Amino acid sequence: SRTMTVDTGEELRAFVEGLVESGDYKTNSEVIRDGLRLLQEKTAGSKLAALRLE
Amino acid sequence: RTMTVDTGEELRAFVEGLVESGDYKTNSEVIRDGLRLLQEKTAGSKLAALRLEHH
Amino acid sequence: SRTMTVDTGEELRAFVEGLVESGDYKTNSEVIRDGLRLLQEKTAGSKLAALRLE
Amino acid sequence: RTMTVDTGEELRAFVEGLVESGDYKTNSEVIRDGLRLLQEKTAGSKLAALRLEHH
Amino acid sequence: RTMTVDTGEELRAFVEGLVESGDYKTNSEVIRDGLRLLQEKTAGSKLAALRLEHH
Amino acid sequence: SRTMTVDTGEELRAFVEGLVESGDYKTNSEVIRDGLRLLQEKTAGSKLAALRLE
Amino acid sequence: RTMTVDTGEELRAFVEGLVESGDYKTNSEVIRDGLRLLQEKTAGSKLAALRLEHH
Amino acid sequence: SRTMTVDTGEELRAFVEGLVESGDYKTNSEVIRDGLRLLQEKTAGSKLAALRLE
Amino acid sequence: SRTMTVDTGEELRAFVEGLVESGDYKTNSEVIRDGLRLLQEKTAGSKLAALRLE
Amino acid sequence: RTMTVDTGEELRAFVEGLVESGDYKTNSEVIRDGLRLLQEKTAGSKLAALRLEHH
Amino acid sequence: SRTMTVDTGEELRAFVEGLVESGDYKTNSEVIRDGLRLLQEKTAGSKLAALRLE
Amino acid sequence: RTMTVDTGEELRAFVEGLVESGDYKTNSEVIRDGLRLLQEKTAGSKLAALRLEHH
Amino acid sequence: RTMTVDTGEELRAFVEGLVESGDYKTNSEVIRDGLRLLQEKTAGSKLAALRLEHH
Amino acid sequence: SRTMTVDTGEELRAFVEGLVESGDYKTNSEVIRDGLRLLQEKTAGSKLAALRLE
Amino acid sequence: RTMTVDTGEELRAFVEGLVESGDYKTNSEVIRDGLRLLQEKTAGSKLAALRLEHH
Amino acid sequence: SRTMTVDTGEELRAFVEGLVESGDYKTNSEVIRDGLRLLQEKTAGSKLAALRLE
């Protein structure tokens, strides 16, 4: 699918809504996808170091 | 405290892969890990610093 | 306003459409905003170094 | 080769500020500068490298 | 998949402080975040590399 | 108190028990405390950057 | 706001190659990109800092 | 050929003429060539990373 | 065996007992093992650089 | 000024290996080298800095 | 004045003439001025560190 | 092995200042120091590397 | 395995200061710590690498 | 005084005598003083960080 | 302003090799280049900084 | 041979004699050899980068 319902917490929601209020982002979804890319890149690196050594 | 988000199918696949690995328990835990990363990057950035020295 | 029409070039459009095809981004607009944030952060740094020295 | 993009008002203000400074000639030049940055960041990233070693 | 751990009172205070902040949901989420950090540090270390080249 | 019961997951438990098996650590608890110190130091840094700017 | 510059043939070839690639629209855009780089390098340098503390 | 006419803008011309006034450079052309070398080196790096991975 | 008696010095003992008092560590032994891991990692690196060049 | 410590067998093997190499004279010298490293890491850390600015 | 006669050596002259042959530079003088700026920036840094500490 | 070079007055002032300091003996020694720096920067650069892999 | 060394008075003062601090037990332990540093610096250096590729 | 008798160990003596044999150093004493300067600089740094924070 | 120095044969070979390369004119120029490096390293070091804050 | 007579300059001699006065060095010759090792290591690196690429 394309939609996901997530338990964020009140503080992290306040953070997301702040990034949207600033105007650097358009929707809460754009903030969440930006965060996912950060974790994805971090995860990819470690997995790259694993395939390389091997 | 629930949020509904448009991930698309590739980033949902990525999230469900990390949960599948077992280092995370729920999809929500993956999302919060990513937002903690984004909060730290935001607070550390030069833009946040430039925006505070308009005091 | 909120909409802007830009001359991109065929190659850079191909780049944008590739990032969307990968799924890491949803619309061409999300790609353009991500790029703007990079330049914005870069610009902010240099301006921060100017106010600091002064 | 034209594209229509939803910037929002703050990032349009930012672009028009850079053109106003004179280091850039058109709004389009600002957008292309940002996409060149994003292309370089993409090509250099660890994700692009991990994605190529599935050959 | 439950584990019982001796934290002492200061590191329990630290964990409960992070949950209190709201960036985490459960004490368990804090522990798993720390173990993910430790796993990444272990895999990246020079000791793990030296230990693999006894193949 | 001093004792805490945590939901780890089978994979992360396998990781802890591997570090103990190696001998670099004595108990599962020593592994968990080492991990907490890493996150604690990481958290302290960001909080230090906040008090400093202010 | 036009300037006439002696590039030589190799650096003209380089510029026209970058325009040919499509990441740039005009020769002028390439020149301005390079001058933006040079301005940033100048402002960041230790010489610019040493020259300001003769105030 | 060897000569090129470029639209610089009033501010970037002021920048070039400032570097010449300082004496670190002799002609506007020397400033422009120095800038080109910076972009050229930057471009070469990324292209080197492309041939290397491949 | 598993137990070792070591001449530490009064100052370094005061250091160990301070890390325990802080609560980040449980026993003097946990402090000593943490220190050993640091030296062990440092030693491993140099030995890795030796096998690699060779 | 003597301390009795539970090393386990692997870290005792490591210590006795370093003494065996000859760069160290006694097991105690290895332990003190490690504690000097830990003291330097502690003093340099961000936690020690954050803990001092509660003055 | 503006002109200086310098004892370079045959090898360093060969180096200068190579940078000119490549086309990245126009005259031997442009190469020498580029080198002077490098040493000048290096010298400025150390002198900046001296005024700062004081 | 002599070369005649157009320095301009500011970079001649800089050279004669370094000789005046005493860390250098002749103007020529300053010029050679700068060219050694430029040779090292050239050999180390990414352009020199990209230019060699057209073999 | 004893060596007699000319330290001069300032570096003897430095050594005896470190022993006085208590992080070291004997003057000899200070000397060996310094030689371990020098051995690591030597093995890691570019000179040691250049000298090995004359094989 | 100026002379010190130290227990080095056979391996570290072999190291010192190797650095002398290479010719980069003249006497065993020059090797020992070079090592002391390394530890001295390392010690000074940490002590500098202590006076600075305070 | 002349100094007589005990180099040993290997470091004399090294100096004469650099002069032979042509990047330097005299043995003295090599010695001064090395002393300029040592002066910069000394001024930049943490020891020089610690020694000044006893004012 | 083993002895070399060098034109240093009054300022660089003052520098050498200062390092000797501090006590970190014993003779002017020890200072000169320390400086040579710095340049030697710097030279070796660049030559290593040349053999490696080739």
PDB file of C-alpha atoms in Angstrom, chain A:
ATOM      1  CA  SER A   1       0.000   0.000   0.000  1.00  0.00           C
ATOM      2  CA  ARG A   2       1.066   3.666   0.288  1.00  0.00           C
ATOM      3  CA  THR A   3      -0.476   4.833   3.631  1.00  0.00           C
ATOM      4  CA  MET A   4       0.806   4.007   7.161  1.00  0.00           C
ATOM      5  CA  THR A   5      -0.587   4.946  10.589  1.00  0.00           C
ATOM      6  CA  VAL A   6       2.094   5.500  13.170  1.00  0.00           C
ATOM      7  CA  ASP A   7       2.282   6.200  16.885  1.00  0.00           C
ATOM      8  CA  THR A   8       4.537   9.276  17.080  1.00  0.00           C
ATOM      9  CA  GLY A   9       4.049  10.789  20.469  1.00  0.00           C
ATOM     10  CA  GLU A  10       3.003  14.319  21.215  1.00  0.00           C
ATOM     11  CA  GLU A  11       6.534  15.787  21.220  1.00  0.00           C
ATOM     12  CA  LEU A  12       7.656  14.296  17.895  1.00  0.00           C
ATOM     13  CA  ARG A  13       4.385  15.402  16.317  1.00  0.00           C
ATOM     14  CA  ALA A  14       5.092  18.906  17.600  1.00  0.00           C
ATOM     15  CA  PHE A  15       8.503  18.591  15.932  1.00  0.00           C
ATOM     16  CA  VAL A  16       6.961  17.532  12.576  1.00  0.00           C
ATOM     17  CA  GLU A  17       4.404  20.292  12.668  1.00  0.00           C
ATOM     18  CA  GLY A  18       7.179  22.775  13.415  1.00  0.00           C
ATOM     19  CA  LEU A  19       9.127  21.776  10.334  1.00  0.00           C
ATOM     20  CA  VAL A  20       5.978  22.191   8.254  1.00  0.00           C
ATOM     21  CA  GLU A  21       5.202  25.576   9.862  1.00  0.00           C
ATOM     22  CA  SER A  22       8.671  26.794   8.924  1.00  0.00           C
ATOM     23  CA  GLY A  23       7.764  26.202   5.259  1.00  0.00           C
ATOM     24  CA  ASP A  24      10.799  24.069   4.421  1.00  0.00           C
ATOM     25  CA  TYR A  25       8.332  21.153   4.063  1.00  0.00           C
ATOM     26  CA  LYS A  26       4.786  20.873   2.750  1.00  0.00           C
ATOM     27  CA  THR A  27       3.117  17.985   4.560  1.00  0.00           C
ATOM     28  CA  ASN A  28       3.733  15.857   7.599  1.00  0.00           C
ATOM     29  CA  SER A  29       4.379  13.073   5.094  1.00  0.00           C
ATOM     30  CA  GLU A  30       7.268  14.956   3.510  1.00  0.00           C
ATOM     31  CA  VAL A  31       8.910  15.269   6.937  1.00  0.00           C
ATOM     32  CA  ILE A  32       8.469  11.554   7.664  1.00  0.00           C
ATOM     33  CA  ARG A  33       9.907  10.549   4.267  1.00  0.00           C
ATOM     34  CA  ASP A  34      12.914  12.838   4.787  1.00  0.00           C
ATOM     35  CA  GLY A  35      13.593  11.129   8.122  1.00  0.00           C
ATOM     36  CA  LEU A  36      13.227   7.656   6.566  1.00  0.00           C
ATOM     37  CA  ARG A  37      15.842   8.527   3.885  1.00  0.00           C
ATOM     38  CA  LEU A  38      18.314   9.504   6.672  1.00  0.00           C
ATOM     39  CA  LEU A  39      17.847   6.132   8.463  1.00  0.00           C
ATOM     40  CA  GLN A  40      17.852   4.335   5.059  1.00  0.00           C
ATOM     41  CA  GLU A  41      21.224   5.908   4.077  1.00  0.00           C
ATOM     42  CA  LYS A  42      22.615   5.091   7.569  1.00  0.00           C
ATOM     43  CA  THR A  43      21.384   1.462   7.234  1.00  0.00           C
ATOM     44  CA  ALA A  44      22.774   1.165   3.661  1.00  0.00           C
ATOM     45  CA  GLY A  45      26.281   2.246   4.787  1.00  0.00           C
ATOM     46  CA  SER A  46      26.596  -0.485   7.434  1.00  0.00           C
ATOM     47  CA  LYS A  47      25.263  -3.020   4.977  1.00  0.00           C
ATOM     48  CA  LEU A  48      27.766  -1.798   2.381  1.00  0.00           C
ATOM     49  CA  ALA A  49      30.591  -2.238   4.884  1.00  0.00           C
ATOM     50  CA  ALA A  50      29.375  -5.797   5.415  1.00  0.00           C
ATOM     51  CA  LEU A  51      29.316  -6.757   1.733  1.00  0.00           C
ATOM     52  CA  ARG A  52      32.677  -5.048   1.136  1.00  0.00           C
ATOM     53  CA  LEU A  53      34.629  -6.816   3.899  1.00  0.00           C
ATOM     54  CA  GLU A  54      33.076 -10.061   2.590  1.00  0.00           C
TER      55      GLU A  54
END
